[PDB]
Design a binder for this molecule. Structure first.
Ligand SMILES: CC(C)(Oc1ccc(-c2cccc3ccccc23)cc1)C(=O)O
Length: 255
């Protein structure tokens, strides 16, 4: 009855996310993008959307397209979280609007290692150093996410842990403008309880793992706010490009 909830959530997570941690770790060893040269020969096969323009824009257009694909997946995942579909539609929409990027950056850690991150469904690998060399302010976009991911990955969670974590992020009672705050809080309370007991069984060698994950929740909220602004600046200083319309509405005057 608590076991069951963890199982239903894990199964929803396996069904709805194309990329997960087991799949990514196996992969992380294919085609490396480490400079402008290797970037272009990536774009002869891997990235077929803006197919020219400034390399910084091509890169993060490709990146925002992946984020939008993750938002799509997160929406299906949430509909499978027991209780979520029973909320008023505007509460479901509100939870997703304010929750998806906290979940995105949490799950992004799974396709990152200290050297770089998987891209294009794991058939490309862009190095951390290469991103760091891009012209300002594009070189500052992914670095704080790598920083988060390195600390997160050190916790050595598996997908059964992460599925519960992501459900807890989405079912959050303090998003602005919720109608049934009481019930969403009870949903959250249940998931977080199951998460704690799950971590105690799956990781009995780390007593402080549950508090460490609650710290990561706090970290992600800060990470998302800071990302919103960096995104805003790039829209102001740069319009060779175009921010995805969905991301525009999500980021707008939230934080
Ligand atoms: C993590 C990621 C990929 O961060 C982005 C960073 C920059 C852009 C971006 C990409 C292309 C043009 C832009 C213009 C103004 C502001 C941002 C952009 C899109 C996403 C995202 O928000 O999904």
């Amino acid at each position: 009855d608590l076991k069951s909830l963890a199982k239903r959530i894990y199964e929803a997570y396996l069904k709805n996310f194309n990329m997960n941690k087991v799949k990514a770790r196996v992969i992380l060893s294919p085609f490396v993008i480490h400079d402008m040269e290797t970037l272009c020969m990536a774009e002869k096969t891997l990235v077929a959307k803006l197919v020219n323009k400034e390399a910084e824009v091509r890169i993060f257009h490709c990146c925002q397209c992946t984020s939008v694909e993750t938002v799509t997946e997160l929406t299906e995942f949430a509909k499978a979280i027991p209780g979520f579909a029973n909320l008023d539609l505007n509460d479901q929409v509100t939870l997703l609007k304010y929750g998806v990027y906290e979940a995105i950056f949490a799950m992004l850690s799974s396709v990152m290692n200290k050297d770089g991150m998987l891209v294009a469904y794991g058939n490309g690998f862009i190095t951390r150093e290469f991103l760091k060399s891009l012209r300002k302010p594009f070189c500052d976009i992914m670095e704080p996410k790598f920083d988060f991911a390195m600390k997160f990955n050190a916790l050595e969670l598996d997908d059964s842990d992460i599925s519960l974590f992501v459900a807890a992020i989405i079912c959050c009672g303090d998003r602005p403008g919720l109608l049934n705050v009481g019930h969403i809080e009870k949903m959250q309370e249940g998931i977080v309880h199951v998460l704690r007991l799950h971590l105690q069984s799956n990781h009995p060698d780390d007593i402080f793992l549950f508090p460490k994950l609650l710290q990561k929740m706090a970290d992600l909220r800060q990470l998302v706010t800071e990302h919103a602004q960096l995104v805003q600046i790039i829209k102001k200083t740069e319009s060779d490009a175009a921010l995805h319309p969905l991301l525009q509405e999500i980021y707008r005057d939230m934080y």
